[PDB]
Amino acid sequence: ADGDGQGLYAANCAACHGALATSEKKGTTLARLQSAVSANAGGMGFLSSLTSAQLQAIVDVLAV
Ligand code: HEC
Numbered sequence: 001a002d003g004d005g006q007g008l009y010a011a012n013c014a015a016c017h018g019a020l021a022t023s024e025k026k027g028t029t030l031a032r033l034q035s036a037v038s039a040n041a042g043g044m045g046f047l048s049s050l051t052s053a054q055l056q057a058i059v060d061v062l063a064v
């Protein structure tokens, strides 16, 4: 259901951080992403429903 991260990034992140292929958040970390949602960085708190498995999948595709 989770895909490989590409759909999750496109649906939840690309509007603010760019298409995955040219994302400004390449090389991010799970700790940065969880902290950004939890701290509402840039208004990101609405993403608090994403699970650890979903956030990690997004981190991993940004590492490729
Ligand atoms: C617009 C409503 C955004 C959504 C959707 C996403 N991000 Fe975001 N994020 C946004 C801003 C304005 C900021 C602060 C400025 C900055 O770009 O740093 C952030 C912050 C982050 C961070 C923390 C900063 C860092 O360590 O680089 C991360 C890790 C981050 N954003 C990642 C990220 C992810 C993975 C998103 C989809 C789940 C996502 N953001 C969505 C604006 C918006």
Ligand code: NA
Residues within 6 Å of the ligand: 040, 042, 043, 044
């Ligand atoms: Na806000």
